[PDB]
Amino acid sequence: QNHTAVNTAQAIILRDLVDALLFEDIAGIVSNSEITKENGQTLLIYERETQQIKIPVYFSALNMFRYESSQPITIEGRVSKQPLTAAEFWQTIANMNCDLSHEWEVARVEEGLTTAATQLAKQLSELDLASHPFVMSEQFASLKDRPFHPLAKEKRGLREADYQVYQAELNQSFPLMVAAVKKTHMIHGDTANIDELENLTVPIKEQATDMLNDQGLSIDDYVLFPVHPWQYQHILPNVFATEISEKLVVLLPLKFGDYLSSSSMRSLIDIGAPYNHVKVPFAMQSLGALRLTPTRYMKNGEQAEQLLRQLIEKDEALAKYVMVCDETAWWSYMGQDNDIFKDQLGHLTVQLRKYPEVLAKNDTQQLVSMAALAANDRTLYQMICGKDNISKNDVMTLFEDIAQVFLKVTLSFMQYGALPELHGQNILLSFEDGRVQKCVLRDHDTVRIYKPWLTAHQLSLPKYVVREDTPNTLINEDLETFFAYFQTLAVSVNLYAIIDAIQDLFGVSEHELMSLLKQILKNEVATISWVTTDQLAVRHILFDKQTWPFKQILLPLLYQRMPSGLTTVPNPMVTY
Numbered sequence: 001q002n003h004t005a006v007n008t009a010q011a012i013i014l015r016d017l018v019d020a021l022l023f024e025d026i027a028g029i030v031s032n033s034e035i036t037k038e039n040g041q042t043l044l045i046y047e048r049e050t051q052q053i054k055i056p057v058y059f060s061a062l063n064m065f066r067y068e069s070s071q072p073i074t075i076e077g078r079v080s081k082q083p084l085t086a087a088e089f090w091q092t093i094a095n096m097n098c099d100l101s102h103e104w105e106v107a108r109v110e111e112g113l114t115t116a117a118t119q120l121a122k123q124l125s126e127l128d129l130a131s132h133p134f135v136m137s138e139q140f141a142s143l144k145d146r147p148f149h150p151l152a153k154e155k156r157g158l159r160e161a162d163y164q165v166y167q168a169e170l171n172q173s174f175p176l177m178v179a180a181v182k183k184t185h186m187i188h189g190d191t192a193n194i195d196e197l198e199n200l201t202v203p204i205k206e207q208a209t210d211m212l213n214d215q216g217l218s219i220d221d222y223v224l225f226p227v228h229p230w231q232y233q234h235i236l237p238n239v240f241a242t243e244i245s246e247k248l249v250v251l252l253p254l255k256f257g258d259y260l261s262s263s264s265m266r267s268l269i270d271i272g273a274p275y276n277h278v279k280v281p282f283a284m285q286s287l288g289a290l291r292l293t294p295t296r297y298m299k300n301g302e303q304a305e306q307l308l309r310q311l312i313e314k315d316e317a318l319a320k321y322v323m324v325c326d327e328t329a330w331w332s333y334m335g336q337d338n339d340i341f342k343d344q345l346g347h348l349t350v351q352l353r354k355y356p357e358v359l360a361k362n363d364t365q366q367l368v369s370m371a372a373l374a375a376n377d378r379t380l381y382q383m384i385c386g387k388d389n390i391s392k393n394d395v396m397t398l399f400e401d402i403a404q405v406f407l408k409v410t411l412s413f414m415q416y417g418a419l420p421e422l423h424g425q426n427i428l429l430s431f432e433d434g435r436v437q438k439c440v441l442r443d444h445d446t447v448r449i450y451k452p453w454l455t456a457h458q459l460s461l462p463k464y465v466v467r468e469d470t471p472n473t474l475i476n477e478d479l480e481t482f483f484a485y486f487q488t489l490a491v492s493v494n495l496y497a498i499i500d501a502i503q504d505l506f507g508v509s510e511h512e513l514m515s516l517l518k519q520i521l522k523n524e525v526a527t528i529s530w531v532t533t534d535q536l537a538v539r540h541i542l543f544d545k546q547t548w549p550f551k552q553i554l555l556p557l558l559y560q561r562m563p564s565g566l567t568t569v570p571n572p573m574v575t576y
């Protein structure tokens, strides 16, 4: 057992837990503590019931307190000289708030923190970096996962053997499996060519044909769907119990191909075609939510991808930098009722993601997800810069370049009333000679829209399949809500996680990196032709307003038996 990897992994889950508690002010850890200073070190004194915690803190570039992770936390009465685990600190906080703990899921958060530390230790210990740079960058994005989130590495439903095979970090390949779906009971994308799906499963077509013939069924009546081996074993026999009885779905115990997981365990990589990914259902619980893409989201992603391509034609900045993944080739089960809203449909789908050909025929450019750059590891920075000897001025110049192209592209989209979900996992940067050449968008199912701006530019609204006269996350009814998903995902999570990584790796101040980010944002907002009636509101929300919205990730996990939530935190752009 690698004891260095266990201690390193335990310290990462503790740091993410304490920071996540401080950002959301869980049990008044900030608001009901006193700021003091013992021997040049700022401390939160959290006193409650009869216990006391001393947290070493520093005022971060988000204008909130963060855990000074170099210094140890002091719990009054704890005589143990060993490092604090995240599970122990959580248990201490829960026992200090007996009134609150009642209505929280204390038991499984404690278990999830233990799992997160165990599985991350495994992945640090047995990290096997792939030879292909894009596959390798996806391993680092998977290793880091959702930043400032202590339960990110917990994958509920996965047994210990499932972690070993499906986690991208360990570099183990696995086959796909087959389910015959009757042609009468399925739909597909408007421009989805069946030839491409047939090409996927063609090696086992003859074996599948024989298996159906030993059952009184004909392959001419069915379409062969790839199924994830976990989805195949644990989910499909139950969710399609009646459909399997009626011979509408047939689970063929076939195995074909050789697939690695990406940053997502749903989007799979064939090493023979590493820019042609296969997305399949994997009904497990990541970040407290059941990882399930409903069939209507793929129909929405088709309408969204269509809008994104119109803005790339229209805008000068988007034409230069932005490319998008083709996700139009998708197939899904469809019950005889023709109710696309049914949750069942999401468990039996297949979606082909074609990355731009320009990249796949360029072996010199390195495709790196912005999630991968948040990983506390030199590998990707040394590859991009082209040297081990990375100076302070090198990485600052590199961050300025990433922040300039990202914030220009993001705000250039937003002026028209369109906002892709731009956390680190959905956007990739094409690096060449240490500079950002291109941005590559993927997962287009959550492109948010502001109708008044789309109407002002005379753009057709995406024909989103949504519940009739009911509010949803896709259509934002005011500018505060529209800019919230930029302020949270793009700046406070994505860009700040890259700042957090660069500080850990190269010792550059996060304050100097935030000043660099702040100035780029001011330059972009000033030079974009906003709808003139709303220009003052854009400036107010970002720069002048005393609060920013913050996406809640811990408090939902305490409430779930998955609630959505924004709360107010201080404006990082404000100096006060």
Ligand SMILES: Nc1ncnc2c1ncn2[C@@H]1O[C@H](COP(=O)(O)O)[C@@H](O)[C@H]1O
Pocket (backbone or CB within 6 Å): 145, 146, 147, 152, 263, 264, 265, 266, 267, 286, 291, 371, 423, 424, 425, 493
């Ligand atoms: N904001 C985020 N930043 C980084 N990684 C994320 C973020 N949100 C989700 N992810 C990860 O990326 C994956 C998203 O793809 P999927 O799980 O297939 O829906 C999940 O497995 C998450 O662990």
